[PDB]
Design a protein around this ligand. Structure first.
Ligand SMILES: [Mg+2]
Ligand SMILES: [Mg+2]
Lengths: 468, 457
């Protein structure tokens, strides 16, 4: 333990040269919080303090600094000179410093990153998203409303033709979007080449019959990069521009896979499937980093969408706080964590145009007028869990935005009239919400929604939708 | 929940078509273990249940008292192409995000022989690195550089020079050492080569440097790898990949694109999955088994308590051996059927500490070695060898060489001298009567309070 990593009250940490982080931290018995914090700061930056030498100018330092402590609540604030991070906008490298070996120190019994802050100067160095929910709405030729999507059930085991036919049914009923299961890939019983081909053919039929475009999100997570690229290129050759998204298992395949697809296919929606995140993010795990932190780094890395839950809706009990925090970190110009306020722009905070855009955001207006080259573009939540037509209105009112993509399973496929009618019932429920008509009244005219009222009030689902 | 996923006592799970797993599993308060097990089996396989075959994961044993659940995965459900990230997405994915499951820790996994056929395993091993170094039998003695981030390229390379000049074999980049402006990647590679050239010229010995190629994206990682290949002589470099943060795909990509380069799996970040304090995740032995399956040449462990040695010893066995034992499953690292007499003889020979030569290269999973992180030094290396029961490891010492009172070069010499004492069955004190580097070390490392001690990986 070297005391030089402890600089309580250091004014300079807010000067824009530092990424900030809050850790919940607790050392093993006999180690003080400040001693523990020094070791965490050291191992997440320069390792050892060196007074003479190193590459810094005489006036410069690369050490992380503990600048605030709350012993009562086992909290420490650490400032990272972001110059220490790899260039080229490398997000896996940041996570390797702050969320790497520190999680392996047996002397640190609690080590949870609760929040991080990116100064405007740092945001310049990272991609942020490029293709957004606004671009997907444009391809779908819809405005304002959420994008209503589906997972297929059973999630693994259908043949390519069976899988595509349920996509056809959902899209045919007015559904917008279908995702592969997060580990749906090149299983021999549903081979990847045929899966893509059969999805295209199913989508062609819906387009011919309804006149409407649709989107399918393909899992391209693979053994290796060459295979993932071969899948992405194959999909681009098999599907019309806009009609496909790329699903990457960001936690298991890796941060590098997210950034690779963001950069090689910038005009394709990049769907960050966060399967596996719970080991980092769950409340029960004292070592890791929280869902809001994950979401912030996913936006920095350039994901177009990342999953959340249903903000407590449908889920018995369940707090909305975390999902709404994540949705706002994903979507807004101004968002807040538990410890840091975040403006998602390289424009300095004092700028009059920026502050006006922040105020207009509070009034419900998009902030693209600032220039996409001066902001971090929006990433959207992808909603996993037990929504159904009876709950979509309450969910919109709870999350406070329509800028999300649902991925409903039971809430469409268990509809007693079938998946097509199930998708229709969700759209009808949305219309009732928009027009301020009760479900019951709106359904007097509409058998799909009427059937959904009778069914989803009472049905005990044998296999409920699960979290992502 | 669906009962179809509960098949307690099903004898077919042992027929070779299933990957087996043991979870420490507990539902949230108010959920029975059987219901929790059914939901976890479903969400890690077919999702929901709907002519002779089936892809559903099967819960085949439950220990209520100890909150243990045994699950069989038909490995046909996994992606083709030997995709390891896909396996982890099934068994270590959304199940960790199920608030209805308050404990969910994969404790062991079992790979049947015909499953192993589908995966690469390692290609370049510690034995290949020994051949490049022109050594036999002994461990490969390596170092981290300190301060780990902040030195110029020339300063970094000069400490490599000092360590290698003293007899050290191996240096690794820090796990997040990359293209920082103050130590740019291209100059780092150039200056490491210049340093290595001087050592070769002055000692006649070859040396190895492990370069972090973890990057923002695949093209950048490949550019770095190709640059290193153009700048360093074959064998003299290894590729360090931050497997947890860069991802499983990065590991497999380097394994396949550069098969004849040592693939150094730096496990920074694994603690969120593996730590005992975290009820949700998967353990170090499980991580190690999947690292070998994916084809890492080495992966980090600790010092086997040199704390209990059990975990690090188990990791070393899963990494290196033809036959290794987890807490719940015995593992033969071969596609050969278990009844095969040659296979059983080889396992017997290995258990007797004897070399076996009766198998043939293409039907076994090659060895991956531990990379030892923590506070070893000349006083402790013999005790570590004895404790881990193998010499097939790479050390990456920091303070245990760089804090040597005579300097880094002398520190590396002292480690080799300590190894010589161990090999020759001579006490450290007796061997050091003639060896001032070791003598200084023996009198220093038993009392020095290190200002910046080595930390785990
Ligand atoms: Mg899924
Ligand atoms: Mg390190």
């Amino acid at each position: 333990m070297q005391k030089e990593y402890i600089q309580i009250g250091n004014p300079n940490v807010f000067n824009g040269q530092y990424m900030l982080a809050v850790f919940r931290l607790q050392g093993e018995e006999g180690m003080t919080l400040v001693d523990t914090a020094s070791e965490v700061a050291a191992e997440s930056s320069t390792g050892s303090f060196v007074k003479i030498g190193t590459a810094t100018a005489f006036s410069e330092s690369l050490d992380a600094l503990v600048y605030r402590i709350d012993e009562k609540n086992n909290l420490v604030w650490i400032a990272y000179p972001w110059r220490i991070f790899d260039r080229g906008g490398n997000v896996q490298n940041i996570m390797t410093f702050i969320a790497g070996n520190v999680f392996g120190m047996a002397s640190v019994k609690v080590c949870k990153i609760l929040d991080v802050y990116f100064p405007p100067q740092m945001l310049v160095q990272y991609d942020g998203p490029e293709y957004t929910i606004d671009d997907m709405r444009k391809y779908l030729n819809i405005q304002e409303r959420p994008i209503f999507g589906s997972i297929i059930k059973p999630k693994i085991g259908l043949t390519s033709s069976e899988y595509a036919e349920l996509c056809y049914d959902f899209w045919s009923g007015g559904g917008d979007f279908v995702k592969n299961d997060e580990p749906q890939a090149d299983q021999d019983f549903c081979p990847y080449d045929k899966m893509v081909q059969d999805v295209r053919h199913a989508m062609d039929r819906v387009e011919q019959e309804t006149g409407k475009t649709k989107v399918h999100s393909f899992n391209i997570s693979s053994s290796d990069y060459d295979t993932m690229i071969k899948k992405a290129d194959y999909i681009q050759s098999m599907m019309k521009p806009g009609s496909y998204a790329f699903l990457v298992d960001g936690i298991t395949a890796g941060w590098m896979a997210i950034q690779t697809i963001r950069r090689k296919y910038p005009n394709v929606f990049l769907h960050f499937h966060r399967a596996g995140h719970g080991a980092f993010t769950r409340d029960e795990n004292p070592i890791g980093y929280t869902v809001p932190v994950l979401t912030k780094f996913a936006r920095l890395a350039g994901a177009s969408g990342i999953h959340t839950g249903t903000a407590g809706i449908g889920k018995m009990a369940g707090s909305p706080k975390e999902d709404v925090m994540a949705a706002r970190h994903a979507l807004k110009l101004y968002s807040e964590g538990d410890y840091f306020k975040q403006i998602w722009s390289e424009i300095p905070e004092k700028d009059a145009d920026l502050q006006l855009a922040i105020q207009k955001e509070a009034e419900g207006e998009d902030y693209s007028n600032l220039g996409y080259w001066r902001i971090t573009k929006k990433m959207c939540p992808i909603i996993s869990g037990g929504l159904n037509p009876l709950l979509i209105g309450k969910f919109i009112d709870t999350v406070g935005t329509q800028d999300f993509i649902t991925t409903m399973g039971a809430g469409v496929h268990s509809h007693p009239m079938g998946t097509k009618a199930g998708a229709t019932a969700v759209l009808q429920a949305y219309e009732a919400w928009k027009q301020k008509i009760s479900l019951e009244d709106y359904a007097k005219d509409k058998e799909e929604l009427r059937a959904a009222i009778q069914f989803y009030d009472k049905h005990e689902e044998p296999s409920p939708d699960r979290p992502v």
